[PDB]
Amino acid sequence: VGRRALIVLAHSERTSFNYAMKEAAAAALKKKGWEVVESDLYAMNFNPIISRKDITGKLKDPANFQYPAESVLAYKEGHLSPDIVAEQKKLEAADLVIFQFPLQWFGVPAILKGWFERVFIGEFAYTYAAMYDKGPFRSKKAVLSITTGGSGSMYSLQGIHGDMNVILWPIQSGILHFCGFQVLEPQLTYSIGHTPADARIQILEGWKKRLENIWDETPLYFAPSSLFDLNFQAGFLMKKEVQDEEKNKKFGLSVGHHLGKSIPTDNQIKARK
Amino acid sequence: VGRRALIVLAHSERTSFNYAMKEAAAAALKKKGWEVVESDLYAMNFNPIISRKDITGKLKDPANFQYPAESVLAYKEGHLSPDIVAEQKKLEAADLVIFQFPLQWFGVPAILKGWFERVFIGEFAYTYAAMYDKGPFRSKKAVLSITTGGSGSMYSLQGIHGDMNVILWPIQSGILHFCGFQVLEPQLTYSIGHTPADARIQILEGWKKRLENIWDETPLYFAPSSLFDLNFQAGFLMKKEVQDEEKNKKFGLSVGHHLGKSIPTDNQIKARK
Ligand SMILES: Cc1cc2nc3c(=O)[nH]c(=O)nc-3n(C[C@H](O)[C@H](O)[C@H](O)COP(=O)(O)OP(=O)(O)OC[C@H]3O[C@@H](n4cnc5c(N)ncnc54)[C@H](O)[C@@H]3O)c2cc1C
Ligand SMILES: Cc1cc2nc3c(=O)[nH]c(=O)nc-3n(C[C@H](O)[C@H](O)[C@H](O)COP(=O)(O)OP(=O)(O)OC[C@H]3O[C@@H](n4cnc5c(N)ncnc54)[C@H](O)[C@@H]3O)c2cc1C
Ligand SMILES: Cn1c(CCCO)c(CO)c2c1C(=O)C=C(N1CC1)C2=O
Ligand SMILES: Cn1c(CCCO)c(CO)c2c1C(=O)C=C(N1CC1)C2=O
């Protein structure tokens, strides 16, 4: 189970609904007996820009600096900047990780994106030998609580912005599942700017009612790494046997693995698949 | 045609392939007679975090600060941070806009994301009344020149990362096209870290050769806003007449508008559709 949760919030105002959402989760998890730790990126004067300054030790190759390799070495020998180290310590402790933020340009706010780049360092958050389902965070669960200005119909299959499921894919699969995370269903609150005071209060309570059994939820579906040949020679491609088996299938496995066929409904929004 | 071009580079090292790619682009356009401006975000020590400080004048509601509204107001009254305004002037002057950068966590670097968040202010870059093809940058053309660590196979339909087209969509559609931009085929250079010196040399040459007739290229396909009911009351949904004619089509219109059907091949990578 999970006695410990980490809530990462990416918003500058104590007056925003996101802040309200953060407080709601905290109070709800605490009442249930969780240990809650927060990462208010803005209140932390958080630096979102990767650079050589993330390494306090001596680079192996100062003339041609390469972040991936350098930050790994830094991780292994113990000389990553003190702030990155402190977030890595929170992640390691946490069972549940809650990412609370407002949608900004079809994605996560620059400051939170930076958090991922500087914190989710190789060896720590992922390895090529243990990708996705076999990643380091496989015993953890992650959820995204997003707020938007645009209504929900704008993000439907016929909505001008298009299918939200496509927007969520890069984040939930690309960042979260890749490191081993079990991604739970996203908490999506559309057009929070056009929501009556009474509705908003219910949203807060709904969020809290959910967090009471958050750990027992069945996570979103992602194609297992067992269906792919996990090696550079093979190109990390889906096993031939698997390709043949799926040719008889109507729907693709996920949004990223739509396989030219149809995408199973709300693959990145609803579980059970 | 276009005489002016702006290149936004999002990389810290001048020894990187990205910097080399940016220099090639510059050289090539200049030889063909273009005015070339650059935004080396790392070199500029660019501030990517949106805050109330992006507004130098008097806010309208300082105690309940809402970025979207306040920032549009500062734009219209002219009290947007000087640095943001300097970048805005670069966009207004450019016909072509090239975005050079390494893929990081299935998206653009945090420093570029922030650049979008702070420079693409309402009214200036977009208006809900002039969405997508009718956006402010409709006479401009934008291109993504991306470098990757993973191989092209990893991002094929049967690769572990799944379709690259899905990763491209939120950026090319949600950010660039939403603002009016005519998005041109991305320049995708895979596993650049595992590419021979000679190969890298030719890559640089093909980019330069491409930039010679870049303006004459037919852009990627996006469903035109004429197909959707552009009004809140309607929820910005596809017109019924249009939904009806598409019922018999086998393919969806694009990645975001797959419509539960089959996404046309390389909708976000190859033009003509
Ligand atoms: C740079 C940028 C890019 C954006 N890009 C997109 C995009 O691509 N797609 C999109 O859809 N949207 C986009 N948006 C809009 C953004 O998603 C919304 O403005 C944001 O989600 C609104 O929520 P908020 O919590 O930040 O703040 P607020 O707008 O303040 O709204 C919260 C509301 O709830 C009220 N409230 C606060 N606390 C409480 C409480 N405890 N109880 C009850 N009510 C409360 C507030 O008074 C307010 O009316 C963008 C915004 C920015 C700044
Ligand atoms: C935080 C982070 C997240 C990442 N996330 C992802 C991800 O989600 N997906 C993914 O696929 N990758 C990812 N990557 C990897 C990244 O995309 C690659 O490391 C990057 O694209 C490599 O290119 P480069 O130009 O930055 O630099 P470099 O690694 O330096 O490589 C350029 C190569 O070309 C050589 N070179 C330089 N200039 C020239 C020239 N003029 N002519 C010929 N050769 C030259 C260099 O010596 C070197 O060997 C991530 C990296 C980081 C740091
Ligand atoms: C800032 N902002 C708001 C909210 C406005 C509330 O005042 C909305 C919702 O329509 C939106 C934005 C914005 O910057 C970009 C939007 N395009 C990418 C999809 C968008 O829909
Ligand atoms: C740093 N890095 C490299 C490059 C390594 C070059 O040796 C690759 C390519 O496999 C990758 C990364 C990285 O940080 C994260 C990756 N996950 C999001 C998909 C990835 O594929």
- Residues having CB closer than 6 A to ligand 2 are A 50, 66-68, 117; B 11, 16-18, 20, 102-106, 147-150, 192-193, 200-201, 204
Three-state DSSP state, B17:
helix
> Whose alpha carbon is nearest atom 8 of ligand 1?
A105
Annotated binding site of B for FAD: 11, 17-18, 66, 103-106, 147-150, 155, 200
In chain A the domains, ranked by start, together with CATH numbers, are 1-273 (3.40.50.360)
Nearest alpha-carbon partner for B109 in B162, B146, B152, B82: B146
CA distances from B216 to B1, B96, B184, B212, B220 (A): 8, 12, 10, 9, 13
- The token pair that represents A213 in the structure block: 């059994």
Helices (H), chain B: 17-31, 41-44, 67-77, 82-93, 110-119, 164-171, 197-210, 240-246
> Whose alpha carbon is nearest atom 2 of ligand 2?
B104
CA distances from B28 to B11, B35, B186, B214, B218 (A): 20, 11, 17, 11, 20
Rounded CA separation A173/A135 (Å):
12
Atom index in ligand 1 nearest the CA of residue B118 equals: 1
CB contact under 8 A, A49 and B162: no
CA distances from A38 to A74, A111, A124, B70 (A): 25, 15, 20, 28
CA of B160 to the centre of ligand 4 (A): 12
Q: Are A140 and B235 in contact (CB under 8 A)?
A: no
CA of A67 to the centre of ligand 4 (A): 11
Rounded CA separation B57/B84 (Å):
14
Helix (H) or strand (E) holding B187: strand B187-189
Which residue pairs, CB below 8 angstroms and at least 24 apart, start in A31-37?
A32/A211, A32/A212, A33/A3, A34/A2, A34/A3, A34/A4, A34/A5, A34/A96, A35/A3, A35/A4, A35/A5, A36/A4, A36/A5, A36/A6, A36/A7, A37/A4, A37/A5, A37/A6, A37/A7, A37/A90, A37/A93, A37/A94
Question: Which residues, 6+ apart, have CB-to-CB distance to A1 below 8 Å?
Answer: A95, A215
Tokens 């297992």 belong to A224
CB contact under 8 A, A235 and B159: yes
DSSP state of B176: I
CA distances from A254 to A259, B32, B152 (A): 8, 44, 19
* Resolution, expressed in angstroms to one decimal: 2.5
Residue A17 known to bind ligand: yes
Tokens 């990145």 belong to A268
Q: Catalytic: which of B149, B174, B193, B206?
A: B149
DSSP state of B237: B
Helices (H), B45-196: 67-77, 82-93, 110-119, 164-171
Of B107, B154, B162, the CB nearest to A254: B162
Supply angle C-alpha A91, A92, A93, rounded to 5: 90
- Residue in A134, A154, A166, A220 to test binding to B, most B beta-carbons within 10 Å: A166
Probe ligand 2: pick from B9, B13, B17, B18, max atoms within 8 Å of CB?
Answer: B17
Closest CA in chain A for residue B168: A170
CA of A113 to the centre of ligand 4 (A): 16
Residue B63 burial (CB count, 10 A): 7
Three-state DSSP state, B137:
coil
Active site residue B149: yes
CB contact under 8 A, B166 and A171: no
- Residue in B45, B49, B232, B251 to test binding to A, most A beta-carbons within 10 Å: B49
Rounded CA separation A16/B50 (Å):
15
Residue A182 known to bind ligand: no
> Whose alpha carbon is nearest atom 4 of ligand 3?
A149
State the distance between the two ends of chain B, measured CA to CA, in whole angstroms. 23
| Residue at A168: amino acid letter | L
- The token pair that represents B122 in the structure block: 């309402």
Rounded CA separation A189/A24 (Å):
14
CA distances from A62 to A66, A70, A91, B192 (A): 9, 10, 30, 20
CA of A106 to the centre of ligand 3 (A): 9
